[model samples]
Target: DGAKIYAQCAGCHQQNGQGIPGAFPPLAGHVAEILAKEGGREYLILVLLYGLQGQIEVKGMKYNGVMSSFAQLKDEEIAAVLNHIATAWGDAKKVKGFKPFTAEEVKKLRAKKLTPQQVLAERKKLGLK
Candidate 1:
């Protein structure tokens, strides 16, 4: 169901969840852990909804690219995309397993109204860097 909605990200992230080395970042393994961290999920969601530009390093791999936001998408769509990634990725065996995002969580995060910089800063504070 939600799998079809993730088609956009599939181009760079690959249908298998393996990204292009040094180009696009992989969404498997520790990536999920990073996203699930404090402020990490919000940060990622925001980035996906508003786009991100500059350099990003995940699991010691550096990815300098721009990500276009899907702000036009509804909260449910966002949740679905994330859920699909979490479950379909290669790292599905980890603890806390793919906890899908709820509309409430998205609303709560939207209520906080933090800027992207603030979100990224919070993630750094939580050692998500």
Candidate 2:
């Protein structure tokens, strides 16, 4: 379900979700950190929907780059990649009752039309950086 969609993400995040060290922040553990926060799953959804730009810190490291929007991808496609990343190397087990994202939920964020910078600002408000 997540093969090709994840292949797209693997370019920057790495096949193992380790990211590029100082470039793309690792989603292996960091996604869980996003999912466990106040914004939680919504944060993950928006990042994929609108992409993220500018700077942010994770695990004491900083990343300032552009993550282009996957909004053109079908809802199911986006959901597949998100679900795949969610479970990488036992990350799903880290959250208390985690379930992968549903295409239905992704469909909702599609209409928001937020900019990449706006999405980053949302993270800033959430204390991500």
Candidate 3:
């Protein structure tokens, strides 16, 4: 189900999660590193729900663009896609104790809507450049 729901994300992130250079950042190894940090897991959820903008670096490369929000997707769908990307690349499972995201988690955060710029701010708060 997650793979099916992930079709939407494939457009930017690519089916292999490698993403386009200087455009859409890869979702493979990048997410695993993010999840390993404090508050990174929750930040991932915010990224999906609120979208992300501003210039950000991933794996030593910079990506400056806007990722549209997927707020229209159901909580469960969001959870599925998150889980898909987290492990689909085979990196997250070995990260600093990876934990699967649940639909409830998405729902709880959904109520706290954030602007894309704020989401970028949050990423900076986590010490991500």
Candidate 4:
């Protein structure tokens, strides 16, 4: 399940998903908010496939670092990780109409290749900056 795959992310984000202050951004409270937004679901998926870099702010904190690509991970695994983050946090439950991610969506986005910086650009497009 996604919990098992999350071990790989624990190194930087921490086992609790709190993330390292001023470094990696926390996935716990933040990810679900993005899921509530338009186009955020796809952006999250692209983030895993293409990685993300540069400065990003989550819950008022700033993280300017490189997130290594997980393009090698299967679509199912990627979807699981996203689903895990979406539900593990308390805030996630508060998001209305929350829908789980799917492997088919991941497959749809896999048709293109993007750099970490480009992924960052996509985040900006969502007005997440």
Candidate 5:
């Protein structure tokens, strides 16, 4: 169900989440470590919904690709994909270990309309620095 919905991300991220070497960062292993953190989750959700351009490093792999927003996708679908990718590639332990994001949580984050810097600040406040 989630894979069917993640068709849009396949263009760059690839259907298997392997991504394009040196172009798009792979979403396996330690990438989940990033997503499981406070700032990481916020960044992921925001970028996935609003888009991300410029530079980013995942699992020490650098990527300079532009990720377009899937803002039109429902919260449930977004959550599903997050959960799906989190569990794939033998990373189920890491993904399932973290708290799953709820649709309501997504709504709350949207209401805040936090800037990227503010999100980072919030993470620092949570002692995630």
Candidate 6:
């Protein structure tokens, strides 16, 4: 069911989470390691909640892709989608305390409105990748 929910991301990330490489950043090799850092979890959630644009570096490369918002997604679905990234695709080994995303956690984020650029700024504020 999570895979079905995560299908929305597949077009860019591919069904394997390997992404397009050089174009779209792979979620497998580097995402978990980045998300394991402080505020990383929130940043990822907000990226889904607000979508991302502009140029940002991930996995030692630059991506200018406009990741559209999935804010319309249900909290449960968001949880599942993130879980798909966190637990699948060889990510768990990189993330130390990899906990599954929960609807409750996602719910708290929606209380505030944030733009994709704002998300990036906050990521910078927190010194996260």
Candidate 5 deviant stretches above 4 angstroms: 114-129
- Number of colliding residue pairs in model 5: 0
Which candidate wins on lDDT?
3
Global lDDT scores for all candidate models:
0.69, 0.85, 0.92, 0.88, 0.65, 0.81
**Lowest-lDDT window of 10 residues in candidate 5?**
120-129
Q: What is the lDDT of candidate 2?
A: 0.85
Give the Å error, residue 91, model 5: 2.7
All candidates' TM-scores?
Answer: 0.80, 0.94, 0.96, 0.95, 0.76, 0.91
For model 4, residues 17-85, the per-residue Cα lDDT tens digits are 888899889988888777777888999999999999999888987888899999899999999988888
Q: Taking the tens digit of each residue's C-alpha lDDT, what string does model 2 give over 95-114?
A: 89887789899999887889
Report model 5's TM-score to 2 decimal places: 0.76
Number of clashes recorded per candidate: 0, 0, 0, 0, 0, 0
TM-score ranking of the models: 3, 4, 2, 6, 1, 5
Residue 20 displacement in candidate 3 (angstroms): 0.8
- RMSD in order of candidates: 2.4, 1.1, 0.9, 1.1, 3.4, 1.5
Runs of candidate 2 exceeding 4 Å displacement: none
In candidate 6, position 73 carries an lDDT of 95
The predicted structure with the larger lDDT, 2 or 4, is 4
lDDT of 1 by residue, 26-126 (tens): 88775567665666667667766666656667778887776676767777887777777777764545646556666666666555555545545655665
Best by TM-score: 3
Question: Which segments of model 6 are wrong by more than 4 Å?
Answer: 126-129
